[PDB]
Amino acid sequence: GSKPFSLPILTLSELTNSRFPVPIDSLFTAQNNVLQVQCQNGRCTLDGELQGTTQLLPTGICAFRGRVTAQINQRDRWHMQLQNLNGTTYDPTDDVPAPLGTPDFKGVVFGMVSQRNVGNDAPGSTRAQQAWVSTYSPQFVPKLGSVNLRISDNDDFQFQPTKFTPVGVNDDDDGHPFRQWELPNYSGELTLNMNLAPPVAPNFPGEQLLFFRSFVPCSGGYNQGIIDCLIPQEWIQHFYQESAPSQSDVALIRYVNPDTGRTLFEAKLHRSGYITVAHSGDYPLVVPANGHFRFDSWVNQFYSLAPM
Amino acid sequence: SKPFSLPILTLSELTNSRFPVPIDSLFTAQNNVLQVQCQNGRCTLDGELQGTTQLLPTGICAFRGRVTAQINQRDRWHMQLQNLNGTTYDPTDDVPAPLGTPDFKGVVFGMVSQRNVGNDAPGSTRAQQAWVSTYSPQFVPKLGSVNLRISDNDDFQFQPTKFTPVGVNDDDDGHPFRQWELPNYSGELTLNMNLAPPVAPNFPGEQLLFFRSFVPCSGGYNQGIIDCLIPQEWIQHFYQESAPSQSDVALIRYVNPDTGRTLFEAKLHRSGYITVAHSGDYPLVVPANGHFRFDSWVNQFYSLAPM
Ligand SMILES: C[C@@H]1O[C@@H](O[C@H]2[C@H](O[C@H]3[C@H](O)[C@@H](O)[C@@H](O)O[C@@H]3CO)O[C@H](CO)[C@H](O)[C@@H]2O)[C@@H](O)[C@H](O)[C@@H]1O
Ligand SMILES: C[C@@H]1O[C@@H](O[C@H]2[C@H](O[C@H]3[C@H](O)[C@@H](O)[C@@H](O)O[C@@H]3CO)O[C@H](CO)[C@H](O)[C@@H]2O)[C@@H](O)[C@H](O)[C@@H]1O
Numbered sequence: 001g002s003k004p005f006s007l008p009i010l011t012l013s014e015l016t017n018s019r020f021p022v023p024i025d026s027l028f029t030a031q032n033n034v035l036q037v038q039c040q041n042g043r044c045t046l047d048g049e050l051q052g053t054t055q056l057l058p059t060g061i062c063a064f065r066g067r068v069t070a071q072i073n074q075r076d077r078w079h080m081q082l083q084n085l086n087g088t089t090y091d092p093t094d095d096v097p098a099p100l101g102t103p104d105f106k107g108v109v110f111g112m113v114s115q116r117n118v119g120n121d122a123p124g125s126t127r128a129q130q131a132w133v134s135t136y137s138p139q140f141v142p143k144l145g146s147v148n149l150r151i152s153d154n155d156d157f158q159f160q161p162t163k164f165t166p167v168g169v170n171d172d173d174d175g176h177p178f179r180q181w182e183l184p185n186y187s188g189e190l191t192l193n194m195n196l197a198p199p200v201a202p203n204f205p206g207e208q209l210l211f212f213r214s215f216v217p218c219s220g221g222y223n224q225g226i227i228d229c230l231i232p233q234e235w236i237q238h239f240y241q242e243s244a245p246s247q248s249d250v251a252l253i254r255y256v257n258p259d260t261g262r263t264l265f266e267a268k269l270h271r272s273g274y275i276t277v278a279h280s281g282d283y284p285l286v287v288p289a290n291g292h293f294r295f296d297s298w299v300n301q302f303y304s305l306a307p308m
Numbered sequence: 309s310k311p312f313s314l315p316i317l318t319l320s321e322l323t324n325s326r327f328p329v330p331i332d333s334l335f336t337a338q339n340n341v342l343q344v345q346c347q348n349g350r351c352t353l354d355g356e357l358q359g360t361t362q363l364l365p366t367g368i369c370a371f372r373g374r375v376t377a378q379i380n381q382r383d384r385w386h387m388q389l390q391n392l393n394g395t396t397y398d399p400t401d402d403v404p405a406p407l408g409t410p411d412f413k414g415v416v417f418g419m420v421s422q423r424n425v426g427n428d429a430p431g432s433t434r435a436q437q438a439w440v441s442t443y444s445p446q447f448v449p450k451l452g453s454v455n456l457r458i459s460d461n462d463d464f465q466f467q468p469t470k471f472t473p474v475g476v477n478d479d480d481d482g483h484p485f486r487q488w489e490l491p492n493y494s495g496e497l498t499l500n501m502n503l504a505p506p507v508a509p510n511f512p513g514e515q516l517l518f519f520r521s522f523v524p525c526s527g528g529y530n531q532g533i534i535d536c537l538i539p540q541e542w543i544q545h546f547y548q549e550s551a552p553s554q555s556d557v558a559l560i561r562y563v564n565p566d567t568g569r570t571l572f573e574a575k576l577h578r579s580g581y582i583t584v585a586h587s588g589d590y591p592l593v594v595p596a597n598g599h600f601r602f603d604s605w606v607n608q609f610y611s612l613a614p615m
């Protein structure tokens with residue numbers, strides 16, 4: 001007596017990237033990486049179990065919340081003691097890789113910091129300015145409970161409640177490139193990451209991962225700002241609500257044009273929350289603007305996809 | 309007849325539908341001459357988006373387009389708008405403004421970013437702080453443009469541009485942040501059109517209930533209050549479900565799932581707003597795990613248990 005699995009009905013431009021808080025721009029299938037994809041945001045099983053650092057709000061993706069408690073004489077100057085994004089106390093002993101929403105790539109996230117005072121020192125006073133968070137930094141230790149910020153104006157920043165709002169990403173300007181498939185060290189140098197969402201890869205000859213791709217903002221230079229996610233944030237939100245039991249390891253899904261009713265191509269949606277297609281080569285898909293996936297049926301690892 | 313329902317989400321799992329931040333608390337407001345007519349966060353219970361409302365949380369108070377000119381005014385940089393998905397904006401559309409446009413008087417602060425296309429350094433990028441004043445005579449998003457204030461006027465080109473909002477404030481010249489005052493979407497001496505209607509209680513003893521956020525501010529002591537009628541996730545849910553409304557009012561209950569108890573009840577009106585039976589301004593204090601559940605369809609004259 002199983003509750004039926006389903007996708008939300010949403011066009012690409014009605015979808016949010018689950019790894020950075022921006023809309024999806026396109027679909028892309030990639031040749032198989034030598035190192036397996038293991039992103040930690042945008043991870044959710046088909047029966048609604050969020051994994052990695054994944055939380056439900058787009059506005060939480062690559063955001064931080066906490067208090068600035070110290071400064072050190074380094075480029076990553078301002079020490080931010082983290083809270084959970086909802087303001088509750090962060091417990092480093094929880095079975096998560098890092099606070100939910102933490103970035104899951106190597107590079108620099110740029111955005112703004114904002115503060116609003118509490119307690120006895122001018123409570124209610126506010127300030128905001130540009131900031132950068134480097135996930136290469138030895139002070140990037142979100143799992144332990146803190147990250148350090150680079151800001152624009154070191155003289156207008158207090159030891160007060162602080163929020164970081166991301167806007168874009170970039171390479172660092174000194175030989176530390178933006179690498180979307182390289183995890184940061186959430187507990188810093190010499191410490192292994194733990195409680196990770198598993199790596200994903202095709203397990204079928206002739207198959208490739210299919211990604212929902214965004215071109216996110218950059219703050220200088222020529223980087224394309226590519227961030228690929230496995231399933232969009234709205235699918236994660238939907239699966240969490242529905243909690244429909246998975247009847248096999250593989251759901252067959254069809255990309256449909258609802259006006260004509262025709263299936264354009266089919267894909268496998270795997271239990272742990274990722275898509276494969278039968279294709280060989282890097283390939284940006286060209287599909288109609290009104291197109292969207294629908295669930296067709298439960299299949300299995302024997303099923304051979306029609307060539308994309 | 310598909311049964312109506314709410315998504316099951318706690319307050320910290322909800323996004324404000326009028327600014328891209330989480331909900332912080334519930335608040336009920338004293339009825340007064342304050343007319344509520346927000347244009348973001350407007351959706352009927354059977355899933356019809358209204359006003360400037362669109363589905364993407366990251367589109368709320370965002371702009372997308374091209375910077376095409378500058379003028380010798382504070383609102384210096386002329387941004388021709390696209391729809392948030394990059395398609396051509398049509399000013400003849402039956403909307404108040406491009407979907408996502410801010411629906412309040414004030415200054416929105418955030419960042420602008422550019423990525424060049426065409427013959428001039430294609431692929432080159434830049435980003436910096438920017439402000440959009442919705443008081444500005446150049447704030448004419450319905451006509452297809454807004455003008456930006458930026459921090460560094462020497463590093464900004466005539467190129468594709470995105471504005472990402474971060475927070476709000478009063479202007480520094482005294483023009484206040486007024487969340488219930490609509491901008492003039494076509495500028496001076498024009499009338500707003502295609503508006504989602506004003507919202508108010510219609511039954512004695514009832515008050516609107518808001519989902520409230522305290523959003524970032526960029527100086528001073530503004531509390532950053534933005535109240536919405538229903539959160540973005542409810543709008544997204546109603547859009548997907550399209551469940552027929554069986555009457556003018558859906559009775560809903562705020563429940564503590566841990567204990568099973570109903571904390572209070574409220575009326576969810578078919579045009580997408582909530583009333584409760586209370587008198588006076590009141591920030592609700594309720595447990596963190598609480599959430600609304602649909603109870604039943606009732607009429608306009610159904611009497612709520614006082615809260
Ligand atoms: C591509 C630009 O990126 C940002 O400026 C970066 C800057 O660029 C300069 C180029 O190096 C130079 O060849 C010439 O084209 O002018 C550019 C801007 O003055 O390089 C510095 C380090 O050398 C920084 O990395 C800057 O971020 C952006 O501000 C510009 O508008 C360009 O898009
Ligand atoms: C509350 C501060 O807001 C920002 O600073 C503002 C600076 O505020 C001044 C007050 O106006 C003043 O009467 C008293 O409080 O001192 C403050 C600074 O001394 O005032 C200027 C006016 O020229 C600007 O409005 C600033 O925004 C923020 O930068 C500070 O950190 C405080 O939170």
Ligand SMILES: [Mg+2]
Nearest residue numbers: 006007294295
């Ligand atoms: Mg489906």
Ligand SMILES: [Mg+2]
Nearest residue numbers: 313314601602
């Ligand atoms: Mg319900």
